[PDB]
Design a protein around this ligand. Structure first.
Ligand code: NAG
Ligand code: NAG
Ligand code: NAG
Ligand code: ZN
Ligand code: ZN
Length: 410
């Protein structure tokens, strides 16, 4: 292709406005909930959500990476993990405002496509089906990036679609998958919350008939969580409905992008006959936070996709990261290239057939490919991270099998 398009994908910033270095490591960050921060530094701690400096450094690397981009995807989760009573609607909005404002200042001429996360509401997870203060606040804040039609829908349901200014036959569809997330009590027993399904189909139909391609953008991913058994993030009923819709329109959709897990994964959606037809990419978080009882977390991550500007086919992805430990040891923001996807795995591109082939390779007995994959899953938080057979089976099946029957069968 005569030119290469690029867009950034950042997700799960989870600013902790509370963060500051002090002698009492239980007081460094409210997001540790009273636990002693492990070894805190100017760029964060594994027991804390992101300090502002960490977030700023990610956007600063972007600015100075010497990579040109046509837009940016931003899949939500801006407030920190503190208990619900410590937060409020007002504080949540300020955090979102702050992130938005911070991006708009540093990238005054970049279109950015946001999606809401499950923490982008007070109380977390309970995102509603009708307009709400938050939905109207993000609409106001995101006007510079979106048209009136998208701003309307955003106010009513927290979802929208929008054509890309530099590639107006590419349409981004930004879903509120939070509506389908297990803990969301507001949508229980609703068949089509906020009408998203009907609006999604109708939008995908329009696209298909207007010679458009679509990138789907959302917070909670479809499918099975790669580190557990028979657990989908979304309630199964909505996972299955989205799957079938994505299969009906696998032609128009040229890629899907998700966050929420804070891990680096892929999924391959196959059509009803077992043929792979859509590639899905879960990007890891900027925040490094974990629970005290977890052995692993992710290092902070930022990524860059390459696409063919004629048909919007995905050509590659570049995953960048911050070695948290190193950065705090030196007090310097060293963002680095973790991998280039086609290089580390030797596949031609990011089309479904290529990713499917890669996943098949992971099922090799003692696959080195899968081992790599597993390290990158945690954005390289520990090299020595090994994996047992059961976990591998959970990972493999989740990559290749998104609906109930297939996954069990696997
Ligand atoms: C966002 O919040 C941080 C700490 O809460 C503050 O230092 C920073 O100045 C704020 N930025 C904007 C653009 O409001
Ligand atoms: C945190 O560390 C301090 C001093 O190192 C210790 O005395 C205190 O008990 C610890 N607190 C918790 C909650 O682990
Ligand atoms: C990051 O930093 C420390 C150097 O302080 C190192 O021991 C660890 O290997 C590094 N992580 C990676 C993925 O190389
Ligand atoms: Zn998150
Ligand atoms: Zn989330």
């Amino acid at each position: 292709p005569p030119a290469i398009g690029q867009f950034w994908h950042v997700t799960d910033l989870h600013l902790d406005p509370t963060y500051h270095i002090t002698d009492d490591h239980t007081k460094v960050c409210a997001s540790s909930k009273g636990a002693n921060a492990s070894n805190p530094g100017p760029f964060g701690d594994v027991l804390c959500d992101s300090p502002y400096q960490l977030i700023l450094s990610a956007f600063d690397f972007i600015k100075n990476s010497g990579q040109e981009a046509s837009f940016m995807i931003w899949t939500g989760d801006s407030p920190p993990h503190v208990p619900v009573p410590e937060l409020s609607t007002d504080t949540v909005i300020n955090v979102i405002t702050n992130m938005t404002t911070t991006i708009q200042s540093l990238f005054p001429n970049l279109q950015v496509f946001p999606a809401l996360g499950n923490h982008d509401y007070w109380p977390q997870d309970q995102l509603p089906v009708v307009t709400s203060k938050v939905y109207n606040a993000v609409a106001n804040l995101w006007k510079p990036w979106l048209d009136e039609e998208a701003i309307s829908t955003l106010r009513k349901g927290g979802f929208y679609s929008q054509k890309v200014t530099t590639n107006p036959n590419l349409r981004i569809i930004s879903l509120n998958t939070n509506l389908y997330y297990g803990p969301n009590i507001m949508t229980l027993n609703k068949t089509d919350p906020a009408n998203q399904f009907e609006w999604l189909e109708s939008t995908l139909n329009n696209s298909q008939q207007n010679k458009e391609k679509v990138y789907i953008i959302a917070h909670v991913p479809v499918g099975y969580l790669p580190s557990s058994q028979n657990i989908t993030a979304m309630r199964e009923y909505y996972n299955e409905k989205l799957i079938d819709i994505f299969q009906k329109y696998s032609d128009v959709i040229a890629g899907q992008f998700y966050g929420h897990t804070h891990r680096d994964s892929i999924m391959v959606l196959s059509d009803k006959k077992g043929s792979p037809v859509n590639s899905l990419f879960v990007a890891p978080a900027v925040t490094p936070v974990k629970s005290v009882l977890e052995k692993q977390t992710n290092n902070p991550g930022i990524r860059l996709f390459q696409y063919d500007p004629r048909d919007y086919k995905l050509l590659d992805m570049l995953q960048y990261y911050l070695n948290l430990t190193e950065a705090n040891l030196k007090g310097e923001s060293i963002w680095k290239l973790e991998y280039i996807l086609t290089q580390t795995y030797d596949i031609e591109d990011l089309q479904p057939e290529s990713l499917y082939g890669l996943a098949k390779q992971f099922t090799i007995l003692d696959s080195k490919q899968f081992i790599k994959y597993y390290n990158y899953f945690f954005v390289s938080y520990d090299s020595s991270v090994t994996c047992d057979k059961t976990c591998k089976a959970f990972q493999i099946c989740a990559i290749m099998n998104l609906d109930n029957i297939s996954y069990a069968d696997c």
